[PDB]
Paper text:
Actinobacterial [name] reversibly catalyzes the thiamine diphosphate-dependent cleavage of 2-hydroxyisobutyryl-CoA to formyl-CoA and acetone. pmc2-Hydroxyacyl-CoA lyase (HACL) enzymes belong to the thiamine diphosphate (ThDP)-dependent decarboxylase superfamily and catalyze the reversible cleavage of 2-hydroxyacyl-CoA thioesters to the corresponding carbonyl compound and formyl-CoA. [name] is the first published HACL crystal structure and forms a compact tetrameric assembly such as the OXC and ALS proteins. Interestingly, a unique feature of the actinobacterial [name] is a large C-terminal lid domain that, together with active site residues L127 and I492, restricts substrate size to ≤C5 2-hydroxyacyl residues.
An [name] crystal structure of an intermediate state was obtained by cocrystallization with the substrate 2-HIB-CoA and the cofactor ThDP. Interestingly, the active sites of the tetramer contain ligands in different reaction states. One dimer within the tetrameric assembly clearly shows a covalently bound postcleavage intermediate, whereas the products formyl-CoA and acetone are bound to the other dimer within the same tetramer. The postcleavage intermediate bound crystal structure represents the second intermediate state in the catalytic cycle after 2-HIB-CoA Cα-Cβ cleavage and release of the first reaction product acetone. Compared with the substrate state and first intermediate complex, an additional water molecule (W2) has entered the active site in the second intermediate bound structure. This water fills the space that was previously occupied by the Cβ hydroxyl group of the 2-HIB residue. In line with this, the second water molecule forms hydrogen bonds with W1 and the side chain of E493. In step 4, the Cα-carbanion is protonated, most likely via water molecule W2 in the second intermediate bound crystal structure. The additional electron density close to the ThDP cofactor was interpreted as an acetone molecule. In contrast, the first lyase reaction product, acetone, could be trapped in the same dimer. Its carbonyl oxygen atom still forms a hydrogen bond with the side chain of E493 as previously observed in the modeled first intermediate structure for the equivalent Cβ oxygen atom.
Author numbering:
A (entry chain B), B (entry chain B): 15 to 598
C (entry chain A): 15 to 594
Amino acid sequence: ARQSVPVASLVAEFLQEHGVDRVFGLQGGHIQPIWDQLARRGVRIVDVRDEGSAVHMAHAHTELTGQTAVAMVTAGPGVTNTVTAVANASVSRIPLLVIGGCPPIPQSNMGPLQDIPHTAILEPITRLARTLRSADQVLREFDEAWARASGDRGEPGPVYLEIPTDVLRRDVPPALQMREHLRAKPKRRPQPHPDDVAAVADLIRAAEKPAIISGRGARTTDGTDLVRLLDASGAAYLDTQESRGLVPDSHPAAVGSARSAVMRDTDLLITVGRQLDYQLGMGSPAVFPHAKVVRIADTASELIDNRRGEVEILAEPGAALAAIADALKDHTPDTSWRDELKAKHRKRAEDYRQALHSTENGADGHIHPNRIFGALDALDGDVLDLGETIMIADGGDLLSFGRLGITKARRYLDAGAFGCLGVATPFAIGAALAYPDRPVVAVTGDGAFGITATEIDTAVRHDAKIVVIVSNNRAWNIERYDQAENYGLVVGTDLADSDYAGVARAFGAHGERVTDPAELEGAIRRALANAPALVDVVTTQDAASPDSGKGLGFVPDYQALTPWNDAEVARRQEGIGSAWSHPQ
Amino acid sequence: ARQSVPVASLVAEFLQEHGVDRVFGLQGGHIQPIWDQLARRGVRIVDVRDEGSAVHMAHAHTELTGQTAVAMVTAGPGVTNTVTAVANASVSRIPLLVIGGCPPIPQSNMGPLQDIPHTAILEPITRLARTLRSADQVLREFDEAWARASGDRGEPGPVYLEIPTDVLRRDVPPALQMREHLRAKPKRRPQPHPDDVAAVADLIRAAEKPAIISGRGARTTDGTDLVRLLDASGAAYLDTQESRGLVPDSHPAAVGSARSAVMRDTDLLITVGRQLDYQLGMGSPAVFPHAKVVRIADTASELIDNRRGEVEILAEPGAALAAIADALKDHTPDTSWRDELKAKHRKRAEDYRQALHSTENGADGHIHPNRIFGALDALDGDVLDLGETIMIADGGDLLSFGRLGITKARRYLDAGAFGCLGVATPFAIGAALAYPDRPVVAVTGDGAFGITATEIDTAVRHDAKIVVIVSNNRAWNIERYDQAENYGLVVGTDLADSDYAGVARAFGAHGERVTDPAELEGAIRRALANAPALVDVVTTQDAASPDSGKGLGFVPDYQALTPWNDAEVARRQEGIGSAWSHPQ
Amino acid sequence: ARQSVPVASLVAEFLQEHGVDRVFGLQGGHIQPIWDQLARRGVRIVDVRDEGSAVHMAHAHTELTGQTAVAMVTAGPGVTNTVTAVANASVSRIPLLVIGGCPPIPQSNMGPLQDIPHTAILEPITRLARTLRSADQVLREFDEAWARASGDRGEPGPVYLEIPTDVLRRDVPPALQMREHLRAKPKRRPQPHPDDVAAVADLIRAAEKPAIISGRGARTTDGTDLVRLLDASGAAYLDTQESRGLVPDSHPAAVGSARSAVMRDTDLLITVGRQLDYQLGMGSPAVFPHAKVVRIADTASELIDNRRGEVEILAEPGAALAAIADALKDHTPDTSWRDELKAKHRKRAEDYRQALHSTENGADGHIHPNRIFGALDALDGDVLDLGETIMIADGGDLLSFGRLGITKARRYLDAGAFGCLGVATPFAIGAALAYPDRPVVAVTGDGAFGITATEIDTAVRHDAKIVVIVSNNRAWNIERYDQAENYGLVVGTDLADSDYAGVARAFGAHGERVTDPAELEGAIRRALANAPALVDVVTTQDAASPDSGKGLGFVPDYQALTPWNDAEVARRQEGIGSAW
Ligand SMILES: CC(C)(COP(=O)(O)OP(=O)(O)OC[C@H]1O[C@@H](n2cnc3c(N)ncnc32)[C@H](O)[C@@H]1OP(=O)(O)O)[C@@H](O)C(=O)NCCC(=O)NCCSC=O
Ligand SMILES: Cc1ncc(C[n+]2csc(CCOP(=O)(O)OP(=O)(O)O)c2C)c(N)n1
Ligand SMILES: [Mg+2]
Ligand SMILES: [Mg+2]
Ligand SMILES: [Mg+2]
Ligand SMILES: [Mg+2]
């Protein structure tokens, strides 16, 4: 079978055999040899307006599908344009491969065109960042890097490979073209230890108010084993931004409008593929004052951070959840606490959803962003099925409203733990190309949207059927609010009444502007029918979000949010005794 | 005088006392304490749509004015959005300070909001990248970093400082607030050694065809000492993209249409504040086959790279040029070679300029980009003075045409050695705010423009009177050309017939589209009268630039350009003798 | 229960509660606050002559006992003196903690005493390297770092923590002193997936010549599940330098003197906690021309390097071995290939061992190093049980002789994949302190010994009952031999006839010089009886070692060894010319 082929040809074959049917990127001569070979093999090339956007598209693809995705960018500014999107994928622990161009070996350190230390810049935010200088070993390096992206020898996240242009053009002998490096590999499935499963089952039997909080790792499962454990355990259930859609909304455990009540009173916190980072108050006793802790994950990045488990299970989370459910066969949980939370949640969530359809305009006479979520809700079952829809959110206040306003989605993506503004359009494109028969709706602040707005062109040229709804409040409004509240002086946080519909139409998309909230349902209906489309909603600056009211803009010393920080300050003063003296 | 003040207040005072009258950035809570204190001191805040753009604006400010400029960006994605612009400033050796936000010390390594290893990511492309954790020493650190940006303990370029939000809020005692750290410092002026000056004078006296090539370091002078040395030496003169405007166009040495002829035949190459990087063929004997080498600079980054000088002068370049001119008092140079180049240059450059006014449309029936440079030339002395105009160029083919088409500018900026697409709009903004009574004209490819187009909003909101002229050829055209030529398959390099005038109007700027080259002068006149303005020129894909024809897209093994690479391959085969054997 | 205590006190308590009963180090003011608190808690301080030797001692302790060991060293040169020993532990994937001193936060970047970028220097060779600037979070950082040393979020290896002296003096409130961070944690035990177990059992049933090669991860087990799989599978068995002692020498699978024959013919290579690095020919098809590959390990650092498995099991290796053994309950392996290798191994190994007793002196009239191994063999079952002895080897030719000359040992340590000369004495000290009732015998080249010789003092002052036997050949001899062979010019590889016995005596150890090989048994008997003790053996420069003439000094393009490299050159020629 095998004959001598150039490195660039073997790279393209590696990718295709690993299940890569599309590559996101932006062409330059340093990667053209691979670009050409991917084209020749029938791999779709999704070319973008800013390399960072290509990496965001890969991120969305992998997060949605489970298939490791690929971005390809040229030397120098091509690679440096990806740093934010790489960092975002690193924080979220998403497997992806970035292939960068780089100058030929002979010109090393001589000031060749577009030279910059790519591997040194990317090393801190990647699982691997390497320059491949041996033609014979390029295939082996690709396969190992792909494994490291899944989390081998680290934790899941992005990897970076570059091949000097002279090496790309070298031949690889047939003997070195080994099938074991070319072939797709299954995910690892480490299994739980029976004694850890029994120990967790014993903690659940002893707990009165157990609570499961899911993350990334749980979201790699279909949710069915998590529901088996919820049923067997009687635990309350919370998800996070990275783990929406695993548990039906009507499930007796699902209490997503009772987040603070669950954290305050749970006596057994079980994390499932979830970090106890700022989004869960660092798992601090100040935020979980009654909780024993158990941690379940396929990576210690979701076992050891900030709190240790009385039990920690390192295993494929589905298998762990199934085994604990099995161990609770003859347990009859006390669900009084869960059922009381659920009764109040059902009413609070229903009332909140219904109020989205009629929210008053703010004091400036413009639309409250809640009306966008109400109009989507009104259209559900009519012109779209939200239960089949990929929902994306981005921005400041808009994003915080979206976490309450978006309840019925198939899948949800957003700015993530990194707070990465500008993901909305690139994520919408990756999602739409992965799921061409699903509605894809991105709701975004105007600040965030300006970062990646020109990717509306990409959506039109590649026919990604996205709908982008802009909360056009002429501001970085959550920042304007923190300025007013904590300094009395608003400066450098105002934007303008930009025609984002006109920007979309300039790039060949359907555009409409809305000033009257009664026009929103019709404008979003027209956008869904004419995707790719943008709806530019003139929204109020008088709309405090849950995040603006909790001090997210101020950056307290110990926690992201003022109320959590207050509890932390109190915790640090406990029981110091006569040892204490005033800082003077 | 002095009392306890918070770190953030002392930072703002440091900046203002160091001559900072504006800061470019994008607000977040992590830098709000400094942002507020700059506002309170009357420092102008130029807030942008993408943090990378703020660093490009600082770069343009410093390159134009000589005053070290400042960008301020928030933690996480705020800092990671600057990497390309930082890299660009590092390659070009431009002093600038980036102030980044970062999370409070107590949350170190805990997964706080927007955490990422900023200093590790930026260390390879900065002169210093530090986290300031001692309130008492913040002022001292700022002043040392500012010195390192000028090139102390390194070479000129960007520096990065971040202050954890808890440290920003700490008080500094009055004793630690030292005037020697707060005060503006003069540039260093190391002086030449008389013996090196005499040695260079002797080499000039012995040379028949001496040639000066200027760079960055020469461009920090007003050009008058360089002209004294040209007059005294009889040398031919070439500039580079980073050193335009130092020598009158009519000067007997100025032979900018004879670049290859000068490099081929010079017997004495004198670099003045210039790197022998890819833009000058690595100073290779393959490109300068007859040249002895002399190097003059205030930094060894422009003395030791790729070629060593028979003499090297490390000194303030003005002083070096003046001293060598003095040493040649009674020398009568042989200028036959110079004067013969000049006679042919005068005619070639005049004919080329005049032909810009009537260039034929390409085979697709659209405008040749040369017509943009002709229309600017036609308007010169009428509605603008090109000799007072800051010209900016960006893109691929468009940029290569611009290097021949732009001859009469006050100052010129472009994509630089790094090939940093998307600098046009941000640079135009920084230039326009530095020089509010000067025309600022940016000519850009459509590919490059999509990266930073949304900064047209910034130009409108801050009233930066820029004119952006887009070469709208519906392509990354220099890439499309290299694909066709070297692979036969054009893929992923096509864009669309986007309404860039409509994008500008969406953001409140004056916009006009041009399809007929006879309308260009009127459209550019209207743009200059209504700045900020954009002219969207529908240009041809049938237009090979000097760069497309020399293989810049292909990346040869040894040089950026095919003809130079050919010469290099020939050089490597010289005189190997019987030792040689076929690679088989 | 808890009250406010200084950081330094909470660090000492963390270590003791994690099972640390000893800390290896060298005092400086930057670490004195911790040093003092360890002393007060009764944690033994083993103070050394060079910080690198403290980290070698920690490495040996962890590798032998399974308990993560700790070195503590001061700012600046105290930390930079550890880099070789840290790199060695990183290469061998040994958990250990290095606690470094560093200057106070207010003097950051001001040129304080002993300042240097410790965390930047150590980042590339550690699983974590951090400066701890929040007193409240030091205990949490220690516990996370300890987990990472075990391999969480990485792979097993050394970690580095430093606390600025101002932070060491800060108080930690009682609420932040969480028991979950202070307490010792069990090792993780990920379990095999039954489908992978069945797939490996199917490959074993279909193989005619299966072979298991063990490494570090197998050596973390007691070997009983490995023997169960050997018995169930009929596989041949090879160990490596890092995995000796798991399988009795008399076991029908143990064919250590047939390494080449095993690699050449096996049709199923099974790696057990082992890397396919240079020591196994990169697992190359050039070196294993008939082998399908299966990989078993609790870390992907021993699954994905160079060769992929048709099946890869990421699990605690004992559990994986046990499950595959179970799956083969009704399998009757064809062991003819195994039994043929074993018959030739038995004869070859026996003849080799017996010849050690009578190896003639070299052409220069001096002892052949094999006589050292013959004398140890003669003493076995008489003066000591080598099967209860911790054997350590170091050097060039001496080490190569040692790999074949040392066949019985409770445990074996050496220079490792990193080729880290000078480990013998510090390893012997860590081993002797960990196993005070076991004989500890370190055989070293004279070149290697010069690096760490002054740690004989440490052995004497801490009563570490070690025996050091020096192959004193007045040379870096494996290097002198490569120069003679390949350049015809020996330069800068000669040493002198140094009195290493006299060095030992100067540091208060027992010393004896041996020039007559018939005196070796007696001298080694006297050394064992008077440990700590050194035997300085005047050995020949004129003796080829098993490693001689194999291109080790040449450093071929593709493989460590010429014959392997030749096979790689031939592999790259296969099918070239054949395009059409
Ligand atoms: C790369 C290697 C692991 C490869 O060595 P191997 O071929 O695995 O050899 P060894 O295990 O040492 O054994 C070599 C041969 O001896 C045979 N052998 C082994 N034991 C015996 C006994 N008891 N009797 C007879 N023969 C024996 C074995 O079957 C091999 O022959 P065959 O069956 O014919 O193969 C090693 O060479 C090595 O580690 N050296 C590199 C240098 C180094 O790491 N040291 C640091 C200091 S020098 C660095 O600067
Ligand atoms: C620190 C160090 N320096 C150099 C080497 C290279 N090296 C490998 S073996 C060897 C010679 C060892 O000499 P010795 O310990 O006397 O053993 P001999 O070969 O003489 O038996 C050398 C220098 C090394 N591995 N480590
Ligand atoms: Mg960017
Ligand atoms: Mg907004
Ligand atoms: Mg173009
Ligand atoms: Mg020796």
